[PDB]
Design a protein around this ligand. Structure first.
Ligand SMILES: *[C@@H]1O[C@H](CO)[C@@H](O[C@@H]2O[C@H](CO)[C@@H](O[C@@H]3O[C@H](CO)[C@@H](O[C@@H]4O[C@H](CO)[C@@H](O[C@H]5O[C@H](CO)[C@@H](O)[C@H](O)[C@@H]5O)[C@H](O)[C@@H]4O)[C@H](O)[C@@H]3O)[C@H](O)[C@H]2NC(C)=O)[C@H](O)[C@H]1NC(C)=O
Ligand code: HEM
Ligand code: HEM
Ligand SMILES: *[C@@H]1O[C@H](CO)[C@@H](O[C@@H]2O[C@H](CO)[C@@H](O)[C@H](O)[C@H]2NC(C)=O)[C@H](O)[C@H]1NC(C)=O
Ligand SMILES: *[C@@H]1O[C@H](CO)[C@@H](O[C@H]2O[C@H](CO)[C@@H](O)[C@H](O)[C@H]2NC(C)=O)[C@H](O)[C@H]1NC(C)=O
Ligand SMILES: *[C@H]1O[C@H](CO)[C@@H](O[C@@H]2O[C@H](CO)[C@@H](O)[C@H](O)[C@H]2NC(C)=O)[C@H](O)[C@H]1NC(C)=O
Ligand SMILES: CCCCCCCCO[C@@H]1O[C@H](CO)[C@@H](O)[C@H](O)[C@H]1O
Ligand SMILES: CCCCCCCCO[C@@H]1O[C@H](CO)[C@@H](O)[C@H](O)[C@H]1O
Ligand SMILES: CCCCCCCCO[C@@H]1O[C@H](CO)[C@@H](O)[C@H](O)[C@H]1O
Ligand SMILES: CCCCCCCCO[C@@H]1O[C@H](CO)[C@@H](O)[C@H](O)[C@H]1O
Ligand SMILES: CCCCCCCCO[C@@H]1O[C@H](CO)[C@@H](O)[C@H](O)[C@H]1O
Ligand SMILES: C[C@H](C(=O)O)c1ccc(-c2ccccc2)c(F)c1
Ligand SMILES: C[C@H](C(=O)O)c1ccc(-c2ccccc2)c(F)c1
Lengths: 553, 553
């Protein structure tokens, strides 16, 4: 007989378990539903469904009416809604984590082995009639053809929200601490064992690397003085594994936490900033505690930087991304009266979701100059040539592309998106519509409804066959955006649960850790509480340039 | 200059932080106290501490008045009290974890590096006057002499609670899955990376060792047949590292999850029983799931055995140990309306505390025979000679030694108690009375108050000089026992928070995991819900012997 779990019969987070030769069962425990497929609502669930307004309506509320949002932000209601946003989003994410690439069920190996990426939905069973489950054709559309006809940028479509490259290089820098897909272990495995905001892109994913980057004096990391400016040390000074083109002199090579950060001047930009901040923090701690050893000066500074990161990510990064009129607030105290797990494991779907390559432009403007991909990529001198001030100013001024909408990835880095779809099929991700149902959305009934247009939608119908066969990453990028927004509903409704759970899931946000002593008295605590992007750059640079996640207009 | 944090100035879980040259500050955050030293109580704390009865009063209520308890056990008050027991006890344990041997302060390294045991109180700073802080003598009492004069058994004292050897072997077996101090890394480090009831003493501490034990057919572990009965295989069959005496060849050995288990027949007994159980569980699962592969059968059986372990420990093991009239209950659902982190880090203090070597008798009786320590230790054939049925009957009939009170450790295994004291001084553990205040108890004002008698008290007062200089492990064993109890209050009041946090902190007790599907349906879920020590033995044997955690009348 055929595998019945290929039909995804279990609704609203119910678990499909195969019993006997030809039967199956759904485990509807705490799903809010009863019945063989978990489609029969309990009194409380029915009372919530016909009173829950559509995700588009709630977006509309958050993006309109400046007058009432000014009132809300200046009252207690700011905290109420921030607590509401945090809980409701994160409660979609299983914690402790549930499945992985090896196991489409709960196991001890899935809990303990942190080298795995986790998954919210199980993979499409290996014995299903069609690659995506039961719907569609026996062979999925060509990955290269799909990227060429639907993802390749014709003309540059700029982001309507005013997102800049300063955001884009932050987005890449920040995420590369919890996205480190293994080379030797293959797909579904991660080198980033911290599984979140651990700053292993600054300190490293292991102790051997960390010790090698540390100066072991005053808690600082090693550095070099070039033209009177502070930069990460050379590989000769800090002998760590760094990915560079075979030939580049070791004098030009810079040693940082993440191995791929020397490839782009934008990545090595922030790496330099955070390094300068770390030592600046250490100087504030050594004054406060002159009896403190190097190790305490180091570890305490790290936690401050971790706190600063989450502060800026929530209140500035996610703020610009969402375009919400609600002034987002980083306050761990909000979740102290609630049932919240202070742990996090990175999901593969989040890894797939965060591929925001449409952000990258056609070229890179630095003042009167205009640098192409073949001038900007692997360039080692640029960062030192222009300096931190001059580059931050240029990245904060240049607009980034629109993520959603489709056909917005520059031809250079299109190969990446091709791999993402190929990787998706190795991982055996479920269809787009099943992830829609998992995140409390209605599945798309037609290809028309996904893209919101006639032409590109009708072409996909011919290639996929059935809408319930549309793939995870294509669906996300092909979906119509919100009125004047950077992407569609799915990117918000699916990404936020992963995102906010990752931020507030950090142990520093727990009642046990969120104390003044953790950060070395009140000084270190205020450093977290009052951190800003503007403060992160200018308190570490000679002059103060234009710095923001949005273009100046 | 003298370090102010040596004076332990911050009371009620206040964190001492060294500011400037010789100044200190207490971090009185969410402790319920304010002021310079966290002694000024908040409105609710004052109310809460004046109304709170002594631990000795609560002990009395739980151990007296059968008529009241028969009523309580038959009503929902059973569930009401057990939830209070669970939540109130385990809240005394910091989670996420706090300190280790490296850091006497909150750090990311302490959080992420699972090789470390955690600790509740920080160490005694190295720049203090006396090794125990400020109080006591410059040179601490001799570890060898201290165990000789106070801990050495003269005449055997049986436990008045009726605890048998079956309990003591379960205790040692059960504990060695989360107590595995890395002899090569040093004290404070652990090989048991699951940090709790992960069954790393049945399936090994690492992945490669697990696979060597696994038969890879029907989810079962490898096994050899002797006398028609099921036993763990040899190292020839399953090539894994086993700590055997020099000269004993691998073919004469038996392969299990814990390396040290070959050294004692009692440890090797339970290893056999749980292995028999796993394969027995696999048989039931295979009938219900013929489509299931090997991996899922093994992983699911493991979870079922984890659930079985926690059930028996709570409802029988802790029941016997406590001797409470309240019928204890394992139901994770009691915590589903509570703030509870489902994670556990094994403490170094919990290690020190669990060295229950007094339990071991003068000799070992197996029916008509009486084996000495030399005859019993490192024995290879005894298990195979008698069988499981016979030795279960044997250990369940012979009384185990009373833990507390003092002077009840056999000379053969007395060298352990010595090493524990010497390990504590390496670990720079805080005084006994400092842990008393840490676990809601009054510090002892004298040694006479600690012991109840007068002779031992006088010489301890001579050797230590001060009661506040007394060490953790000597203090736990020499303390007066509750009338007709196995040990004193400090073993309960300090040990209960660790063990209950360890048991319920297991991810299977979370709302996400605690589902029937996790255990392959209702069949596996019931096995967990109806687990017994009796059922663990007599469902894996041909005949059922006397099996209990206590002796017969
Ligand atoms: C959890 O925490 C444990 C720490 O308690 C971790 O175990 C420890 O791991 C460290 C490093 O991995 C081991 O190193 C020891 O620390 C000494 C510090 O002084 C160290 O001396 C220095 O070693 C440097 C290398 O790390 C060395 O620099 C040289 O590096 C290269 C050669 O390695 C070359 O490029 C050059 O020769 C450099 O000079 C420097 O010169 C010093 O000699 C020494 O190596 C020590 O061995 C610890 O042994 C170890 N502690 C233990 C086992 O107790 C553990 O890994 C953590 N767990 C996880 C999962 O991360
Ligand atoms: C033009 C600059 C960029 C280059 C050259 C680049 C390069 C790459 C490549 C080649 C991969 C896949 C590795 C493979 O071949 O298998 C990758 C992965 C990834 N990309 Fe980019 N990328 C760029 C921009 C960005 C930006 C701006 C973001 C925004 C967050 C981003 C997000 C990611 C993420 C999250 C991954 C997964 C990390 C991992 O490999 O584990 N990329 N990048
Ligand atoms: C006659 C049987 C026993 C023998 C021969 C014995 C001896 C030993 C030895 C040699 C060790 C390893 C070295 C050490 O840590 O001291 C050890 C560890 C330990 N034992 Fe026992 N003991 C016995 C009974 C018990 C009992 C009844 C308990 C109660 C649970 C117990 C609990 C422990 C604990 C908690 C450890 C520490 C584990 C570690 O960190 O390695 N032992 N014992
Ligand atoms: C890397 O980038 C640097 C920018 O600092 C490049 O140097 C500039 O190159 C342009 C031509 O593209 C010249 O017109 C400028 O005069 C150069 N500026 C400076 C300050 O030297 C450099 O060519 C790039 N390197 C590589 C290998 O592509
Ligand atoms: C539960 O989900 C299954 C998905 O397979 C539904 O399908 C079943 O019922 C259909 C209509 O009666 C039949 O045509 C299918 O053959 C049958 N599928 C199987 C595997 O037996 C089923 O209707 C759903 N049940 C309810 C109550 O809605
Ligand atoms: C957890 O992740 C994987 C599980 O597949 C482990 O890697 C495998 O280990 C086994 C036994 O050692 C090998 O046979 C496989 O070849 C390995 N697969 C790989 C490397 O892809 C890994 O060892 C585990 N990690 C930890 C920390 O337990
Ligand atoms: C622009 C098209 C008009 C449709 C009005 C949608 C506004 C959403 O209104 C929603 O109505 C639902 C009832 O259907 C309720 O359950 C929601 O709580 C309510 O807000
Ligand atoms: C739900 O539908 C929503 O209706 C809103 C009307 O209030 C529109 O503004 C949204 O764009 C539309 O999607
Ligand atoms: C004015 C009130 C709107 C602000 C409250 C935001 C509620 C949190 O956002 C909610 O996230 C859930 C989890 O993904 C989704 O299922 C909901 O549709 C979404 O609105
Ligand atoms: C009728 C007796 C049952 C009362 C339920 C109390 C169980 C909580 O246990 C309590 O833990 C406290 C914190 O660890 C200790 O200080 C108390 O002495 C202990 O009884
Ligand atoms: C209402 C609780 C306040 C009394 C706590 C006093 C501490 C006395 O302690 C307890 O007193 C009990 C009195 O019944 C005795 O039976 C116990 O053995 C004794 O330890
Ligand atoms: C606060 C707001 C909300 O939860 O709706 C929100 C939170 C997080 C994201 C977000 C989505 C994907 C990657 C990174 C962040 C997002 F797009 C919107
Ligand atoms: C239920 C009871 C209580 O909390 O008081 C209780 C719970 C756990 C222990 C216990 C103490 C030390 C090691 C193992 C178990 C104990 F001794 C008593």
């Amino acid at each position: 007989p055929v595998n019945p779990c290929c039909y995804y019969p279990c609704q609203h987070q119910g678990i499909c378990v195969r019993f006997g030769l030809d039967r199956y069962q759904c485990d509807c425990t705490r799903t809010g539903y009863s019945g063989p497929n978990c489609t029969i609502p309990e009194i409380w669930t029915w009372l919530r469904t016909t009173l829950r307004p559509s995700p588009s309506f709630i977006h509309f509320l958050l993006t309109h009416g400046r007058w009432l949002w000014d009132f809300v932000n200046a009252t207690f209601i700011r905290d109420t809604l921030m607590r509401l946003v945090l809980t409701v989003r994160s409660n979609l994410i299983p914690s402790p984590p549930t499945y992985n690439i090896a196991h489409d069920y709960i196991s001890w190996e899935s809990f303990s082995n942190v080298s795995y990426y986790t998954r919210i939905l199980p993979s499409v069973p290996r014995d299903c009639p069609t690659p995506m489950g039961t719907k569609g054709k026996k062979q999925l559309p060509d990955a290269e053809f799909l990227s060429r006809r639907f993802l390749l940028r014709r003309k540059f479509i700029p982001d309507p929200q005013g997102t800049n490259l300063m955001f884009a290089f932050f987005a890449q820098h920040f995420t590369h601490q919890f996205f480190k897909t293994s080379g030797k272990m293959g797909p579904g495995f991660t080198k980033a064992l911290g599984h979140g905001v651990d700053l292993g892109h600054i300190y490293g994913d292991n102790l051997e690397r960390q010790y090698q980057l540390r100066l072991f004096k005053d808690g600082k990391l090693k550095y070099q003085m070039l033209n009177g400016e502070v930069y990460p040390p050379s590989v000769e000074e800090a002998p760590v594994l760094m990915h560079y083109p075979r030939g580049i002199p070791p004098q030009s090579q810079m040693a940082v936490g993440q191995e791929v950060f020397g490839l782009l001047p934008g990545l090595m930009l922030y790496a330099t900033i955070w390094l300068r901040e770390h030592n600046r923090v250490c100087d504030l701690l050594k004054a406060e505690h002159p009896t403190w050893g190097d190790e305490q000066l180091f570890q305490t500074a790290r936690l401050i930087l971790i706190g600063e990161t989450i502060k800026i990510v929530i209140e500035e990064y996610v703020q610009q991304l969402s375009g919400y009129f609600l002034q987002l607030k980083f306050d761990p105290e909000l979740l102290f009266g609630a049932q919240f797990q202070y742990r996090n494991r990175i999901a593969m779907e989040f890894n797939q979701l965060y591929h925001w390559h449409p952000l990258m432009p056609d070229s890179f403007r630095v003042g009167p100059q205009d640098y192409s991909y073949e001038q900007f990529l692997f360039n080692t001198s640029m960062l030192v040539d222009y300096g931190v001030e001059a580059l931050v100013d240029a990245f904060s001024r240049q607009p980034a592309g629109r993520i959603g909408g489709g056909r917005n990835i520059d031809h250079h880095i299109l190969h990446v998106a091709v791999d993402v779809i190929k990787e998706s099929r190795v991982l055996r991700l479920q269809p787009f519509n099943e992830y829609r149902k998992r995140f409390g959305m209605k599945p798309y009934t037609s290809f028309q409804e996904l893209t919101g247009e006639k032409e590109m939608a009708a072409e996909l119908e011919e290639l996929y066959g059935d809408i319930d066969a549309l793939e995870f990453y294509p669906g996300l990028l092909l979906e119509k955006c919100h009125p004047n927004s950077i992407f569609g509903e799915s990117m918000i409704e699916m990404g936020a649960p992963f995102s906010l759970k990752g931020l507030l899931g950090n142990p520093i946000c727990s009642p046990e850790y969120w104390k003044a002593s953790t950060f070395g008295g009140e000084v270190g605590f205020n450093l977290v509480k009052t951190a800003t992007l503007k403060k992160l750059v200018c308190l570490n640079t000679k002059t103060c340039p234009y710095v923001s996640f949005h273009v100046p207009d």
